[PDB]
Amino acid sequence: IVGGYTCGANTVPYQVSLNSGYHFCGGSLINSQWVVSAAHCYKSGIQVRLGEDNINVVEGNEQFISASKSIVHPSYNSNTLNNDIMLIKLKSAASLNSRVASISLPTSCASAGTQCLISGWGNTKSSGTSYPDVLKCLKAPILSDSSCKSAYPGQITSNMFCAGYLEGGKDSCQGDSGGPVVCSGKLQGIVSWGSGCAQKNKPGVYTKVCNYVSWIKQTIASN
Ligand SMILES: [Ca+2]
């Protein structure tokens, strides 16, 4: 996260870390057995790490559970990143408590102007690299569809929205991919892509989760 603040241990209880030997992407816990992340975070051998704050220290609230199957969206396009969303089923159900909790799926799409919380363990610098060990947080507004498309001409689909600041300085970044954008207690976005991080007129682009709610619900119901 560039230009954010330290969340505080376990203040974002639905945040997961996807680990294949090292942290490579974020994700959100949507019920005791399913995680939603970005389709571009797909790989085999994923271990889901719940209840994390410092991903390099075992502090006592962690649950490490292996994934039993991953399901990338049927229309994921890796060249355009349209439909960048994937579901991971855990091999065992997570034990839910105040520090490990699920986030609700939205009933409505959130409008431009809504302030949201974005979190993850991605890079914290706009040029150069420094990866945090503890979870970082950023409050950012959803931007209008016209600001988003004027920033990324020919690249924004209806399954995408922008959030952040056109002045730059604050944004998610590499490593935050797959992670949550929560607005009014509902998961509305998944960290997906952007041009660099925290650049002027280059806000983050996020997968619009409210378009995928029937696919999530039907897939969970049969798998
Ligand atoms: Ca830890």
Angle, vertex CA 23, rays to CA 55 and CA 44, nearest 5 = 140
| 18 bridge partner residues | 25, 48
Distance from the CA of 59 to the center of ligand 1, in angstroms? 5
**Beta strands 180-183 and 160-163, pairing class:** unpaired
Locus of tokens 């995680």: 35
All structural domains of the chain, each given as residue ranges with its CATH number in brackets, are: 1-12+103-210 (2.40.10.10), 13-102+211-223 (2.40.10.10)
Catalytic: which of 84, 102, 176, 192? Answer: 84
- Rounded Cα distance, 1 and 173, in Å: 6
Residues with CB under 5 A from ligand 1 (ion): 52, 54, 57, 59
Q: Determined by which method?
A: X-ray
Residue from 28, 37, 70, 177 carrying the catalytic annotation: 177
The pair of three-digit structure tokens given for residue 167, joined into one six-digit string: 């002045």
Q: Calculate how far, in angstroms, residue 197's C-alpha sits from the geometric centre of ligand 1.
A: 26
Centre of ligand 1 from the C-alpha of residue 93, in Å: 19
- H/E segment holding residue 210: none
Question: What number of H helices and E strands is found in the chain?
Answer: 2, 13
What is the DSSP code string of 103-166?
Answer: -BPPSSPPPTT-EEEEEES----SSS----SS-EEEEEEBPPHHHHHHHSTTT--TTEEEES-T
Which residue in 17, 28, 37, 40 is the catalytic one?
A: 40
Q: Is 145 a catalytic residue?
A: no
| Residue 39 DSSP code | G
**Residue pair 46/66 in contact by the 8 Å Cβ criterion:** yes
Cα gap 190→205, rounded to integer Å: 9
- Asked if 16 contacts 28 with a C-beta cutoff of 8 angstroms, the reply is yes
Annotated binding site for Ca(2+): 52, 54, 57, 62
Give the strand order in the sheet containing 160-163: 5-6, 136-141, 115-120, 180-183, 186-193, 204-208, 160-163
Binding site feature residues for substrate: 171-172, 174-175, 177
73 counts as catalytic: no
Q: In angstroms, how far is CA 121 from the centroid of its own chain?
A: 11
